[PDB]
């Protein structure tokens, strides 16, 4: 004899927590730059790195 309000007491964190899941996992904080100087390693030697 209880009404449909029974189902209203239901809680649905299932959909919320599927939503929160990350689409892309990031190996590095920002994409690595890919450009090789013509001199080569020379530049790093300039700053001793």
């Amino acid at each position: 004899l209880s009404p449909t309000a029974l189902f209203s007491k239901f809680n649905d964190e299932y959909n919320y927590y599927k939503e929160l899941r990350a689409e892309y996992k990031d190996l590095a904080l920002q994409p690595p730059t890919v450009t090789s100087s013509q001199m080569g390693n020379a530049f790093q030697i300039a700053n001793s790195i």
């Binding site: 020379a42 030697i45 300039a46 001793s48």
Partner: protein, 49 residues
């Protein structure tokens, strides 16, 4: 000879001259074609560095 600038060394010799004097120097060296043929690279580096 080896200059060894900025911790990096190579046989080539580096000279620097102002814009005005370069053409006069070229005119003075016009008599010597083989030396001029030997010039490798010319770069307009900023003066501040």
């Amino acid at each position: 000879k080896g200059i060894t600038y900025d911790y990096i060394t190579s046989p080539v010799n580096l000279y620097v001259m102002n814009r005005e004097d370069f053409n006069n120097f070229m005119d003075k060296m016009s008599k010597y074609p083989w030396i001029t043929q030997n010039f490798q690279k010319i770069i307009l580096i900023p003066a501040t560095f």
